[PDB]
Paper text:
NoV VP1 has two principle domains, the shell (S) and the protruding (P) domains, linked by a short, flexible hinge. The S domain builds the interior shell that forms the basic structure of the icosahedral capsid, while the P domain dimerizes constituting the arch-like protrusions extending from the shell. HuNoVs recognize histo-blood group antigens (HBGAs) as attachment factors or receptors which play an important role in the host susceptibility to huNoV infections. BV, a clinical isolate, bound uniquely to the Le, but not the A and H antigens, making the BV distinct from other tested GI NoVs that bind generally the A and H antigens.
The native BV P protein was crystallized under the space group of P61, containing two P protein protomers in an asymmetric unit, related by a non-crystallographic 2-fold axis. Peptide chain ranging from K230 to L526 can be modeled, while distal parts of two loop regions in the P1 subdomain (see below) comprising Q260/N261 and G502/G503, respectively, could not be modeled due to un-interpretable local electron density maps. As expected, the P protein is dimerized via a non-crystallographic 2-fold axis, forming an arch-like P dimer in dimension of 54 Å × 62 Å × 67 Å. The P dimer is stabilized by the vast monomer buried surface area of 3,733 Å2 (including two monomers) comprised of both hydrophobic and hydrophilic residue interactions contributed from both P1 and P2 subdomains. BV P domain retains the basic structures of the GI NoV P domains. The P1 subdomain, constituted by the N′ (K230–A279) and C′ (A420–L526) terminal regions, forms mainly the legs of the arch-like P dimer (see below), while the P2 subdomain, formed by a large insertion from R280 to L419, builds the majority of the head of the P dimer. The P1 subdomain is a mixed α/β structure containing an amphiphile α helix and two twisted antiparallel β sheets: β1-β9-β10 and β9-β11-β12-β13-β14, where β9 strand was shared between the two β sheets. The P2 subdomain is constituted mainly by a β-barrel structure formed by two twisted antiparallel β sheets: β5-β4-β8 and β8-β2-β3-β7-β6. The major structural differences among the four P domains reside on 6 loop regions, including the previously identified A-, B-, P-, T- and U-loops in the P2 subdomain and the S-loop in the P1 subdomain, consistent with the variations, insertions and/or deletions of the sequences of the loops. The five loops (A-, B-, P- S- and T-loops) occupy the majority of the top surface of the BV P dimer. In contrast, the S- and T-loops become shorter and less exposed in BV compared with other three GI counterparts.
Numbering used by the authors:
A (entry chain A): 230 to 259, 262 to 501, 504 to 526
B (entry chain B): 230 to 500, 504 to 526
Write the structure that this text describes.
Amino acid sequence: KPFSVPNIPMNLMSNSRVPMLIDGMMVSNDQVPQFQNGRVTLDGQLQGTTTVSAACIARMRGRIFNNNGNYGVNLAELDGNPYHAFDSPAPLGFPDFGNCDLHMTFVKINPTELSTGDPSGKVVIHSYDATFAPHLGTVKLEDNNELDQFVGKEVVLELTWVSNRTGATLNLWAVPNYGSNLTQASQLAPPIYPPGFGEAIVYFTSTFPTVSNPKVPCTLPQEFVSHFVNEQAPTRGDAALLHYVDPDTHRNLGEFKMYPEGYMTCVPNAGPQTLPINGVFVFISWVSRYYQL
Amino acid sequence: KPFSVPNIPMNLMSNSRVPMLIDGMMVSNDQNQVPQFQNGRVTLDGQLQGTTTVSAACIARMRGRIFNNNGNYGVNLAELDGNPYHAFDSPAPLGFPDFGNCDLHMTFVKINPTELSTGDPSGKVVIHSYDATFAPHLGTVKLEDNNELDQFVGKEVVLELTWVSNRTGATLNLWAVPNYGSNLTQASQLAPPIYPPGFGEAIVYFTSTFPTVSNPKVPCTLPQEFVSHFVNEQAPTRGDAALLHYVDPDTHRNLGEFKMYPEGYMTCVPNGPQTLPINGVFVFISWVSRYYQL
């Protein structure tokens, strides 16, 4: 089966780290990416905490508890089935923002708890300290005096906004310490390094309320991930050459190389100019690693 | 291109009316019920309808600038990317919730980067999907004043549907089509109603458990990833219906036959689909007659 990428304009696809439309792409000015969401091989093998649907991105599910003076969530997969530590660093879709304050909105999700009343709440979750242990199945919730009614209840949580940990800057490249002090989490997607030849890793961006740095970078659009999982196309070269084309004339606006590990590069800054955000990526061919952009 | 449907298990795909994994299939209690959802609407050859978007990231969201007119609060709507809603193509901005005659409980955040340097950008608000003040087709919806909106007046926000309650005096009817508003001679832009096939067939609805309180099961007529699949493929529609098998992902046994029609929905002949495992994979078998017997 021939390899391909989605025919969809970039600005109609979602970020893979937050559920937001992509509003740009850029190379970094500096920081090694080791995102756990948006990770997949070109032949469709999911990595880290990455799953298929954008509906899963940056969400959690589980049962709220109160134990030894502290509140928390016992995690499950987003469909309510159990999280098995062997399969991944955390349940699929779990936010991959580390060393920061995750401001979550949540709702009760048991149908029997959704007959009457207001099922909703909000809570802060630190992606740091030993009590942040999603690989072990648990995370601490900061007590906001409004959690008691939810103790024992199953909820789904979504990432509403993010702030820095007090005393620290907000680092969107930090890897969460999923396994606490017990172990390095199983099946972490690896860090990515650029290959040479002037190439730089491309990040797809979304404006999002990561307060103090409201531009979330990811290494693949979510719909690329589902595309590769769907296709399972064998990888047949060092790199997949893509052209980013005008959506109407199909004229090439810029070349990119996608590597088997599931990320792409460019040689930036080829006369000042700005690429539009409504272009379409098109697979041209497998090329050697020596292909010069 | 040859036609196909996603090679993804059903329970890994999203509902098209809320961003939630599909956890079931059902037929309607009244098999003559006419759905006219505005999200999850697309033809088999990839033409979007209603407020349907490509990405699940857009489902049941809104964007716009909050206003206060003499104590009447509201949002002047835009598309989710911040560009203007021109109403050329859709009855509301793309992704807009299609739950009608009910109380939408939204969570929102300021979305201008200059408003995202420090502080808490978040809030919540109730929006009624009823009354003339709910006029998203005309670019405006009323916000219920919760005494916490003033700091956001003049600010651009993105809103998402957190949960839904019934309108006082009414049941929470998930088949209701919102009254999006009319604008003189301009077309409604509504995705059309789907009339039940009859003769033993029944429309298949993909369901998700969701906090539509008092009715916590949201039905839709296509998984969201079917929509992006068809938009991507643009496969010419070569028959009046597409025969699908729903197959066990392991054993690869056919668990049931379905028909997909060009308008972008699926039917079955209940014996019903609700009893099927939810981890199966739909597979395109062949183009068949619209009269093909399941």
